[PDB]
């Protein structure tokens, strides 16, 4: 029941490797990592791959962990009304045109954050149209499948199975084992 | 008394090579070209090395040939009042900040055009301060020594000799043999 330390120092075992391989095969992607907390995952991801010259366009109903993780990095934030895609496209166009505030230089990067299922409304996210705009405007996509994985779809793979979307158009997928697997952690 | 054709086709002789070498040695630069007209030189230079995403900051008293050459290329033009350097620095700063019009992207290039001696006022150009700002703000310098070369300076080299400026801070120097050499052409 005792760990050794960080994964980089001594903490890794073969069980971690097996779990990562099995999760990656289950989702349909190439590789995966596992952590000991979902809140920590969402809080420490964006700090790692973002900066203060980038932009994040996230839904207004996102979880608190995503907000904390984005706040820790330094990027700019703009939100669109929940379940509205014309507003999303309009915001994307306007923010590409305007550029960085007070300097008007081109945005170095644009990331879109959403959720597979919002667990206060019960609604889904319009994944096919999100893929359409991300391909058209060269954005990136981040999806949080905390409540979708394991419990939705014909065989339980989430919203990609529900909408028939190939799980290669989504740049980063993350979820937790807490909701529908009776365990703890994230990936 | 007959030429053959363009310099690229058959028109070159050894006399052209000797003249280019001697002019380059006389001015103090590394290499030079000679043409058959000064108006044509000024009209066809900027078309060759400029574009529509660049900016030209020229004095308000420049010759007509410079204006035609700049107009033929497509670049944007802004002028500063004659004999005023605070306005020049202010314009440089504002135009670097603002960027390309209606798009606000960074200026791809900035070129400053002046004259060694303005042959309607009799005044010179403040070469040392022009060099100071071009070095400070990373601009480029173009000088038109039509009336200065041959007839000004301790030994007749122009405004570089008058101000003691090393003729390496000036990116492009051009003049004519019409005024003070009793001939025709330009370099």
Residue with tokens 């050459």: B69
CA distances from B68 to B62, B176, B179 (A): 11, 17, 21
CA atoms B96, B100, B104, B109: torsion sign: negative
Our CA-based measurement puts residue A102 at a distance from the nearest CA of chain B, in whole angstroms, of 10
Q: Which residues sit opposite B142 in a β-bridge?
A: B113, B172
Alpha-carbon separation of residue B11 from A31, B4, B45, B48, B64 (angstroms): 67, 5, 20, 21, 29
- The encoded tokens of residue B25 equal 């040695």
DSSP SS3 for B140: strand
- Measured between beta carbons, which residues in chain B are less than 8 angstroms from residue A104? 99, 104
* Torsion angle in degrees (nearest 10) through CA of A178, A180, A181, A185: -20
Neighbours of B101 (CB within 10 A): 9
User: Is A129 in the B-facing interface, judged by CB distances under 8 Å?
Assistant: no
In angstroms, this model's resolution equals: 3.1
CA distance A125 to A127: 6
> In this structure, what DSSP letter does residue A126 have?
-
Structure tokens at B171: 């990116």
| B21, B13 Cβ separation under 8 angstroms | no
Q: Give the mutation candidate from B95, B104, B105, B108 for the A interface (greatest A CB count, under 10 A).
A: B104
User: CB burial class (10 A; 0-12, 13-18, 19+) of residue A114?
Assistant: buried
In residues, how long is chain A? Answer: 187
User: For residue A144, what are the CA distances in angstroms to A85, A134, A159, B71, B181?
Assistant: 18, 16, 10, 55, 79
Query: In the beta sheet, which residues pair with residue B69?
Result: none
């Amino acid at each position: 029941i005792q760990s050794g330390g960080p994964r980089a120092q001594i903490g890794t075992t073969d069980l971690h490797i097996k779990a990562e391989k099995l999760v990656a095969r289950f989702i349909g992607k190439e590789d995966a990592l596992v952590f000991s907390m979902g809140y920590g995952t969402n809080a420490n991801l964006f700090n790692a791959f973002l900066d203060k010259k980038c932009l994040v366009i996230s839904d207004e109903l996102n979880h608190t962990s995503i907000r904390t993780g984005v706040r820790l990095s330094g990027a700019a934030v703009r939100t669109f009304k929940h379940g509205d895609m014309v507003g999303l496209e309009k915001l994307i166009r306007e923010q590409i045109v305007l550029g960085q505030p007070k300097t008007n230089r081109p945005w170095k990067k644009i990331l879109i954050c959403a959720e597979g299922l919002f667990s206060m409304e019960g609604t889904l996210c319009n994944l096919p149209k999100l893929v359409e705009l991300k391909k058209k405007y060269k954005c990136y996509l981040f999806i949080d499948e905390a409540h979708s994985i394991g419990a939705m779809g014909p065989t339980g793979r989430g919203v990609c199975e529900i909408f028939g979307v190939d799980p290669k158009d989504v740049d980063i997928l993350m979820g937790t084992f807490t909701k529908s697997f009776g365990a703890a952690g994230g990936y």
